[model samples]
Target: GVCWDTGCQLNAWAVRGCAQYGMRDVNMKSCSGGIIYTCCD
Candidate 1:
């Protein structure tokens, strides 16, 4: 298993939440809003 940092974990959680609600291709910004989310696929 890969350990994610706090920001990454939060981003993953947000993505999952969006997914649960039927959203796709969601992007999660970094803590500083400088980096964009990268899709695993």
Candidate 2:
């Protein structure tokens, strides 16, 4: 899934996304307009 705030910092996007979405050991799978993660449970 994409980030909650797509217009924020670029460096910490993964960390921010994981924390916000309650994901663990996430990976930035792809990036288009935003980012796509290997979304975990």
Candidate 3:
């Protein structure tokens, strides 16, 4: 799993966010403040 490093929206928005990094998968959780996501190949 690759940490997003920045914030991102949840659901499809989060998935799309990962896509921007050339990843096709995303994982989310409450790491600190709001929701967070991870990019995976």
Number of the top-ranking candidate, with TM-score as the measure = 3
| lDDT (tens digit, per residue) of candidate 3 on 1-41 | 34454554455443445567677545665543345557665
Q: Kindly report which residue stretches of model 3 are placed more than 4 angstroms away from their true locations once superposed.
A: 1-16, 31-34
Full-model lDDT for every candidate: 0.39, 0.47, 0.54
Model 1 ranges with Cα > 4 A deviation: 1-17, 32-41
Best by lDDT: 3
TM-score of each: 0.24, 0.32, 0.36
Ranking by lDDT: 3, 2, 1
Rank order (by TM-score, best first): 3, 2, 1
Model 2 lDDT at residue 32: 48
lDDT of 1 by residue, 1-41 (tens): 22221244444433544344344443555554233443332
User: Could you tell me which 10 consecutive residues in candidate 3 have the lowest summed lDDT?
Assistant: 8-17
lDDT of 2 at 2: 43
Local lDDT at 5 for model 3: 44
How well is each residue in 1-41 modelled by candidate 2, as lDDT tens digits? 44232333444444545555566534564554455444456
lDDT (Cα, 0-100) at 37 in candidate 3? 51
